[PDB]
């Protein structure tokens, strides 16, 4: 029941002592299904620091402090495990390898693309897969629609302009225009589809009056002749 | 911790970079073909393995370029204000 | 398949036009399409059915 987020809700409301999640076997163990060993760098670790520092004053009504302090031993162990492992890494480096740049070029580029979830080229009908396309399109629109409207830039080239306290430099909206061309073209997609429907079905529905090798074919020139045969009059 | 790179740094360090990004690409292909969005814990933990390899080559081996290709800009928040002329209904 | 298209007519013509030129160089065999329509055991069976129809009608 989001035990790692209810502590964030109690911290953001500035009242993590008046309730303090009411830690028993019925409440502290129901939202956990021992605390579940949180994942973030410090966004869920600084919460447990303040949660222990607040529950230092009751210190006996909440039995889950032993479960929190056991993971405090595991955090200090795995940091100490890594700090010995980082030291055994930095000695196990061969003094000559000469890491190749054009593979590190392919390693800096492909890592940067795989970070923010885009398709990486290697260089090393069917409505089932139609929903899997439109679920990534609607994924992008709902990600563009959570950015703040007051987004501004800062290039490294403004120091030649000597911007004063109130100067209104002209490079402030070089990220804001690109975020609204992207958000609005992802809504006019079925609009260019209707034009491309009206474009393809207007240039290809004839297909034998402009294309020369098709209007100079035997079967088409005979058929266009055959449909223009006027009826024979009887007597 | 590390648990694999100390054994591998005695030989080449770049082969685990090549073999794991293919696993990152294959798991991402399995993520798009499952209509899921969040990355798995198996490839996120595998992601911090790759960044630790290239960092120590820049740290200790000190690669002859470490190429700088930056956009030389970064998004920042700017202030906002309503107008001071009052509303007319 | 009961109708023909402009795609169907040109594919019928081009496949038939390329196979006759493929016989002069003889890089195709075309022996299965010869002897099955010759069928010389049927041709004598055609003859023997013609031979008995002499005997039956005389």
């Amino acid at each position: 029941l989001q035990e790692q987020s209810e502590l964030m809700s109690t911290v953001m409301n500035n009242t993590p002592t008046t309730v303090a999640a009411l830690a028993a076997v019925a409440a502290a163990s129901e939202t956990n299904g021992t605390i579940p060993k949180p994942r973030s760098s410090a966004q869920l670790e600084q919460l447990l620091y303040r949660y222990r520092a607040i529950q230092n004053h009751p210190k006996e009504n909440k039995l889950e402090i032993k479960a929190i302090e056991d993971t405090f031993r595991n955090i200090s162990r795995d940091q100490d495990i890594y700090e010995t492992k980082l030291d055994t890494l930095r000695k196990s480096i061969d003094k000559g390898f000469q890491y190749d740049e054009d593979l590190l070029n392919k390693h800096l580029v492909a890592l940067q693309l795989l970070e923010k979830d885009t398709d990486v080229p290697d260089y090393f009908g069917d409505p089932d897969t139609e929903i899997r396309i439109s679920a990534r399109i609607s994924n992008r629109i709902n990600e563009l629609e959570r950015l703040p409207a007051n987004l501004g830039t800062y290039s490294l080239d403004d120091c030649l302009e000597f911007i004063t306290k109130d100067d209104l430099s002209s490079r402030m909206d070089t990220f804001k225009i690109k975020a609204l061309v992207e958000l609005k073209s992802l809504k006019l997609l079925t609009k260019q589809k209707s034009i491309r429907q009206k474009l393809i079905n207007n240039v290809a529905s004839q297909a034998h009056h402009n294309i020369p090798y098709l209007r100079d074919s035997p079967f088409t020139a005979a058929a266009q002749r055959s449909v223009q045969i006027r009826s024979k009059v009887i007597v | 911790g590390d648990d694999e790179i100390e054994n591998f740094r005695n030989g080449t360090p770049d082969k685990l970079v090549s073999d794991s990004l293919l696993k990152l690409k294959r798991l991402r292909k399995e993520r798009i073909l499952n209509k899921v969005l969040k990355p798995t814990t198996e490839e996120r933990e595998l992601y911090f393995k790759v960044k630790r390899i290239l960092k120590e080559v820049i740290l200790a081996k000190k690669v002859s370029k470490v190429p700088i290709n930056n956009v030389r800009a970064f998004p920042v928040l700017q202030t906002n204000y309503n107008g001071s002329i009052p509303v007319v209904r | 398949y009961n109708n023909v298209t402009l795609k169907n007519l040109t594919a019928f013509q081009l496949l038939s036009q390329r196979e006759n030129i493929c016989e002069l160089l003889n890089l195709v065999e075309s022996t299965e399409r010869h002897n099955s329509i010759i069928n010389p055991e049927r041709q004598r069976m055609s003859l023997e059915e013609m031979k008995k129809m002499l005997d039956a009608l005389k």
Partner: peptide
């Protein structure tokens, strides 16, 4: 984790003899 330029990502990214031998005879 610094972003890379877009104009750099777009920058990094028997059948003969079967007929000839048939053409020399006939």
């Amino acid at each position: 984790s610094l972003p890379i330029e877009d104009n750099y990502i777009r920058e990094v990214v028997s059948k003969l003899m079967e007929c000839v031998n048939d053409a020399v005879q006939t």
